[PDB]
């Protein structure tokens, strides 16, 4: 079957066609998985169907961990590499659209951050700056 390599942008569990998790393992960022090119919808959410050993299997990865999610900033936001370290001097402005990858991360400061940027760089934005 036709397969395409997709980079995992956020630690992703495997799910079956019933939105229930498959196994205890998880594919870690930023590794690559082979999936079907066209996407599918489970419970309204977008998924990729995993291809293993040349055949499609009952394993699905949430597309938010591959394609991400286009979000709009409601505040001006800095780009962070950790809780206290700034990643650069980029200042994202209110109204700009940014793609975030996967569920938010809780840093050690207690606040929650979104991984941004289609790359492997430690670039995070506070969730409180979105919606």
Numbering used by the authors: 314 to 444
Manuscript excerpt for this entry:
S-layer proteins (SLPs) are self-assembling, crystalline proteins coating the cell surfaces of many prokaryotes. We determined the atomic resolution structures of all functional domains (I-III from N- to C-termini) present in the three S-layer proteins SlpA_ac, SlpX_ac, and SlpA_amy. The Lactobacillus S-layers are anchored to the cell wall through interaction with teichoic acids (TA), either lipoteichoic acid (LTA) or wall teichoic acid (WTA).
The SlpA protein (~46 kDa) is the main structural component of Lactobacillus acidophilus ATCC 4356 S-layer, built of two domains. The N-terminal region is involved in the self-assembly of the S-layer, whereas the C-terminal part is involved in the attachment to the cell wall. The amino acid sequence of the C-terminal SlpA_III domain is sequentially conserved among Lactobacillus. It consists of two adjacent repeats of the “SlpA-motif,” the “Surface layer protein A motif/domain” (InterPro: IPR024968). This domain is involved in the binding to TAs (teichoic acid binding domain; TAB domain), one of the components of the bacterial cell wall. The crystal structures of the TAB domains (SlpA_ac_III, SlpA_amy_III, and SlpX_ac_III) reveal high structural similarities. The general structure of the TAB domain consists of two cell wall binding motifs (SlpA_motif) which are connected by a short linker and arranged as an internal homodimer. Mapping of the surface charges indicates a large, highly positively charged region within the interface of the two motifs that extends to the C-terminal part of the protein. The four residues observed in the vicinity of phosphates are conserved with the proposed binding motif of YxY….KxxN. SlpA_III, the teichoic acid binding domain, is not involved in the self-assembly and protrudes inward to the bacterial cell.
